[PDB]
């Protein structure tokens, strides 16, 4: 679409300095042509142009004191991107790499993901360039308290609901909540455990298998990372028939053919993550396997690719070693783990099925929105499916075949456009 292509171009220019954000926009909008074309009324109200600008952005100074009485100051963020369908919802990420571009891309992704759950929740994202690593508990508490001393005013039950994410575990949330309860004095219930993510991902794969008249039973899966997201996958994979043979880190990745399918193998994933060493080989040391120093696991022969580590983890080169291994299933679980070039390439590859992280990892937020153990697994499992089927049906309707990527975008977007169109020119 010319409207679509323009806006993209405009964003590229305007936010050249926020690459992650630009990347995300291209990808999503690029998939939107067909729809925009059938909705000429969108351009009339500059819909795309409004969508790409967060409704509201908050950056704030977060000064705090360490255990030695030394003062540190970090930056806090809260990006309330789109609330067309409901109160903003999104996690907080505490990592030294966090900035506006990153919060913006996540926030943007979050509104689409939130749109797909069928739950009426908008998208937001927050965080800080603060690094919980190396910090005392007391120090996290103090930081969290400082962080919430400002944030509290921008959020609230039917306004903005924060949740957990990278750097923000139950502990951080507990510390922030206490500060919130102390200030506002209201204290609702939980200002917002990843096996849901991991599980939902696998539950999605099933729907894929089935659509493909296929089976998970006896499949080799390559994971990236060894964090909560891989672990929850490996677990479910192992329990469902398949088995993981790869985990990667910043020091390379390891190959395990027996599969990471044993109560003990997996529990090590917990040990390594809680060991703050951030080194995959510790595993190579543990279970006496082969570890490949400073390498990416995408040259391994596998039935399925399931990247659960970091962004742009898969560029073009890596995608060439993949299609060159005739892997039929590339499944994003971590946010943008593939360069937009890489992906297109794959989307381009005819025998393979590609799934988008925004759909695939919508497991966590689902549950969250859900506030027993199996009234759960049940719904997560089920909704994960409807999400798969919905995306599939949509791509088709628009004559794209089995494009799970576009489909996801079209479905989530469709829910938003309608809302914004009904609500008029205000936001």
The distance of closest approach from Cβ of residue 231 to a copy of itself in the complex, given in angstroms and rounded to an integer, is 23
One residue of 2, 38, 67, 324 binding a copy of itself per CB under 8 A: 67
What is the C-alpha separation between 302 and 252, in angstroms, rounded?
A: 18
Residue 153 interacting with a copy of itself (CB under 8 A): yes
What is the C-alpha separation between 277 and 273, in angstroms, rounded?
A: 8
What is the C-alpha separation between 334 and 412, in angstroms, rounded?
A: 18
Cβ distance to a copy of itself smaller for residue 44 or 263:
44
CB 134 within 8 A of CB 95: no
One residue of 10, 12, 26, 65 binding a copy of itself per CB under 8 A: 65
Contact mark string toward a copy of itself, 156..185, x via CB under 8 A: xxxx----------xx--xx-xxx-xxx-x
Specify the stretch interacting with a copy of itself by CB under 8 A; choose among 80-88, 212-220, 309-317, 399-407.
Answer: 80-88
Any long-range contacts for 266-270 (C-beta under 8 Å, 24+ apart)? Answer: 266/231, 266/234, 266/235, 266/238, 269/226, 269/227, 269/230, 269/231, 269/234, 270/231
The distance of closest approach from Cβ of residue 416 to a copy of itself in the complex, given in angstroms and rounded to an integer, is 13
Residue 351 interacting with a copy of itself (CB under 8 A): no
CB 71 within 8 A of CB 65: yes
Specify the stretch interacting with a copy of itself by CB under 8 A; choose among 153-161, 202-210, 229-237, 351-359.
Answer: 153-161
Burial 280-310 (b: 16+ CB within 10 A, else e): bbbbbeeeebebbeeebbbbbebbbbbbbbb
User: Which tokens hold the place of 27?
Assistant: 């990808």
What is the C-alpha separation between 119 and 195, in angstroms, rounded?
A: 20
The distance of closest approach from Cβ of residue 425 to a copy of itself in the complex, given in angstroms and rounded to an integer, is 6
For 66-107, list the strands marked E by DSSP.
71-82, 88-94
Secondary structure letter of residue 258 according to DSSP: S
Q: Are strands 220-224 and 160-163 parallel, antiparallel or unpaired?
A: unpaired
Q: Count residues near a copy of itself (CB under 8 A).
A: 61
Burial 342-376 (b: 16+ CB within 10 A, else e): bbbbbbebeebbbbbbbbbbbbbbbbbbeeeeeee
The distance of closest approach from Cβ of residue 150 to a copy of itself in the complex, given in angstroms and rounded to an integer, is 7
Cβ distance to a copy of itself smaller for residue 188 or 324:
188
User: Which tokens hold the place of 5?
Assistant: 């292509």
Site residues for a copy of itself, window 271-290 (CB under 8 A)?
A: none
For helices 19-30 and 404-423, the axis angle rounded to 10 degrees is 90
One residue of 39, 72, 286, 320 binding a copy of itself per CB under 8 A: 72
Site residues for a copy of itself, window 119-148 (CB under 8 A)?
A: 120, 138, 141, 144-145
The distance of closest approach from Cβ of residue 426 to a copy of itself in the complex, given in angstroms and rounded to an integer, is 4
Closest CA to 221 of 194, 257, 193, 188: 257
Residue 39 interacting with a copy of itself (CB under 8 A): no
Told to judge if 13 belongs to the known catalytic residues of this protein, a careful annotator would answer: no
Residue 232 interacting with a copy of itself (CB under 8 A): no
What is the C-alpha separation between 312 and 333, in angstroms, rounded?
A: 12
Q: Name the one residue in this structure whose structure tokens are 């969250």.
A: 368
Compute the CA torsion angle 360, 362, 363, 365 (nearest 10 deg).
Answer: 170
Residue 374 interacting with a copy of itself (CB under 8 A): no
Question: Which whole-number Å values give the CA distances from 193 to 132, 199, 252, in the listed order?
Answer: 19, 11, 27
One residue of 86, 90, 132, 356 binding a copy of itself per CB under 8 A: 86
One residue of 17, 258, 285, 341 binding a copy of itself per CB under 8 A: 17
One residue of 13, 40, 44, 350 binding a copy of itself per CB under 8 A: 44
Cβ distance to a copy of itself smaller for residue 28 or 408:
28
The distance of closest approach from Cβ of residue 120 to a copy of itself in the complex, given in angstroms and rounded to an integer, is 7
CB 59 within 8 A of CB 128: no
The distance of closest approach from Cβ of residue 141 to a copy of itself in the complex, given in angstroms and rounded to an integer, is 5
Q: Which of 104, 113, 125, 135 is catalytic?
A: 125
One residue of 46, 258, 276, 378 binding a copy of itself per CB under 8 A: 46
Cβ distance to a copy of itself smaller for residue 175 or 268:
175
Specify the stretch interacting with a copy of itself by CB under 8 A; choose among 42-50, 252-260, 261-269, 337-345.
Answer: 42-50
Residues marked as catalytic: 125
Residues that bind a copy of itself (CB under 8 A): 17, 44-46, 49-50, 53-61, 63-65, 67, 69-73, 75, 83, 86-87, 120, 138, 141, 144-145, 149-150, 153, 156-159, 170-171, 174-175, 177-179, 181-183, 185-189, 422-427
């Amino acid at each position: 679409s010319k409207y679509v292509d323009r806006v993209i171009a405009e964003v590229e220019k305007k936010y050249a300095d926020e690459p992650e954000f630009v990347q995300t926009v291209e990808e999503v909008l690029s998939s939107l042509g067909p729809v925009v074309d059938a909705h000429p009324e969108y351009e009339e109200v500059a819909l795309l142009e409004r969508m790409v600008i967060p409704e509201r952005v908050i950056e704030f100074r977060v000064p705090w004191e360490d255990d030695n009485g030394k003062v540190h100051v970090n930056t806090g963020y809260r990006v309330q991107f789109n609330g067309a369908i409901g109160p903003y919802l999104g996690g907080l990420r505490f990592a030294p790499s966090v900035n506006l571009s990153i919060m913006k891309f996540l926030g943007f992704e979050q509104a689409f993901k939130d749109s797909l759950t069928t739950l009426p929740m908008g998208g937001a994202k927050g965080g800080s360039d603060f690094d919980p690593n190396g910090k005392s508990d007391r120090e996290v508490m103090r930081f969290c308290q400082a962080f919430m001393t400002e944030l509290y005013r921008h959020i609230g039950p039917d306004i903005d609901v924060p949740a957990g994410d990278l750097g923000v575990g139950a502990r951080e949330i507990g510390y922030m909540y206490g500060q919130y309860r102390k200030i506002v004095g209201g204290f609702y219930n939980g200002v917002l455990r990843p096996e849901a993510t991991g599980y939902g991902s696998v539950y999605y794969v099933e729907a894929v298998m089935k659509h493909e008249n296929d089976t998970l039973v006896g499949k080799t899966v390559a994971l990236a990372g060894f964090g909560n997201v891989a672990w929850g996958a490996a677990k479910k994979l192992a329990e469902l028939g398949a088995k993981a043979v790869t985990l990667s880190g910043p020091d390379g990745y390891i190959y395990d053919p027996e599969g990471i399918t044993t109560e003990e193998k997996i529990n090590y994933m917990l040990e390594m993550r809680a060991s703050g060493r951030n080194k995959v080989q510790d595993y190579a040391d543990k279970f006496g396997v082969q570890f490949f120093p400073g390498e990416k696991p995408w040259g391994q022969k596998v039935d399925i690719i399931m990247p659960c580590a970091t962004q742009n983890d898969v560029d073009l080169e890596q995608a060439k070693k993949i299609v060159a291994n005739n892997v039929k299933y590339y499944i994003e679980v971590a946010n943008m783990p593939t360069t937009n070039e890489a992906l297109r390439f794959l989307m381009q590859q005819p025998n393979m099925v590609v799934a988008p992280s925004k759909a695939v990892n919508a497991g966590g937020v689902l549950v969250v929105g859900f506030e027993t153990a199996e009234e759960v697994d049940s719904k997560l499992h089920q909704v994960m499916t409807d999400i798969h089927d919905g995306s599939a049906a949509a791509a088709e309707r628009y004559g794209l075949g089995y494009n799970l990527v576009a489909g996801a975008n079209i479905v989530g977007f469709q829910k938003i456009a309608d809302a914004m169109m009904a609500q008029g020119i205000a936001w």
